[PDB]
Amino acid sequence: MTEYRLVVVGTGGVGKSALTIQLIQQHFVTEYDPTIEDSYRKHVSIDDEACLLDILDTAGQEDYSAMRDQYMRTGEGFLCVYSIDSQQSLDEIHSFREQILRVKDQDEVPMILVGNKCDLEEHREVSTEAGQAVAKSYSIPFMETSAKKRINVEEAFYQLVREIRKY
Ligand SMILES: Nc1nc2c(ncn2[C@@H]2O[C@H](COP(=O)(O)OP(=O)(O)NP(=O)(O)O)[C@@H](O)[C@H]2O)c(=O)[nH]1
Numbered sequence: 001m002t003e004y005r006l007v008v009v010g011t012g013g014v015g016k017s018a019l020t021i022q023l024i025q026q027h028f029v030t031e032y033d034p035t036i037e038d039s040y041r042k043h044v045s046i047d048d049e050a051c052l053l054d055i056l057d058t059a060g061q062e063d064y065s066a067m068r069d070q071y072m073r074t075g076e077g078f079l080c081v082y083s084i085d086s087q088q089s090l091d092e093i094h095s096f097r098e099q100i101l102r103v104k105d106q107d108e109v110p111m112i113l114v115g116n117k118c119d120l121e122e123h124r125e126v127s128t129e130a131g132q133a134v135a136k137s138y139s140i141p142f143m144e145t146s147a148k149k150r151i152n153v154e155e156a157f158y159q160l161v162r163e164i165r166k167y
């Protein structure tokens with residue numbers, strides 16, 4: 001069957017790991033256990049095609065940027081995650097994209113922009129519009145997600161597989 005290697009990137013604390021564990025294990029990680037690097041494997045069916053997903057969960061903290069560089073290099077597509085309560089997490093997305101394109105040595109790489117923590121409406125400071133504006137500037141799909149409420153979790157990983165399929 002077809003294997004897809006998906007990498008989750010974005011700054012520290014935005015919910016990378018929680019989104020991964022929702023996808024893999026259908027439960028919400030309430031603790032913040034910061035990642036250096038973890039990987040997971042799941043067999044799924046996407047558009048009635050047999051798939052194997054390899055998910056690389058990477059460190060968002062800046063002190064680990066070089067380890068992240070190395071682990072990213074086997075990725076085929078990327079989830080670029082910010083959180084809607086943090087404009088700084090969105091502003092850092094530009095640098096994550098840049099790092100992705102440099103490590104893959106390509107002008108375009110399958111990737112989707114993910115504004116996580118959308119259940120935190122009381123804390124929102126990035127509008128859906130503002131997220132959609134960043135994705136539009138890079139010609140990539142956009143989705144708001146919630147690891148806590150299970151909103152668009154499967155959707156975001158599966159759409160990334162569809163981005164990889166057309167690459
Ligand atoms: N309210 C809410 N909290 C979330 C959501 N996703 C993750 N969190 C919370 O945010 C914290 C950080 O989550 P985590 O997935 O560890 O962040 P990360 O992006 O992997 N951090 P790192 O880059 O350091 O490994 C955790 O307490 C977690 O419960 C969400 O969708 N909504």
Ligand SMILES: [Mg+2]
Nearest residue numbers: 016017034035
């Ligand atoms: Mg993590």
Ligand code: NA
Nearest residue numbers: 033034035036
């Ligand atoms: Na730990």
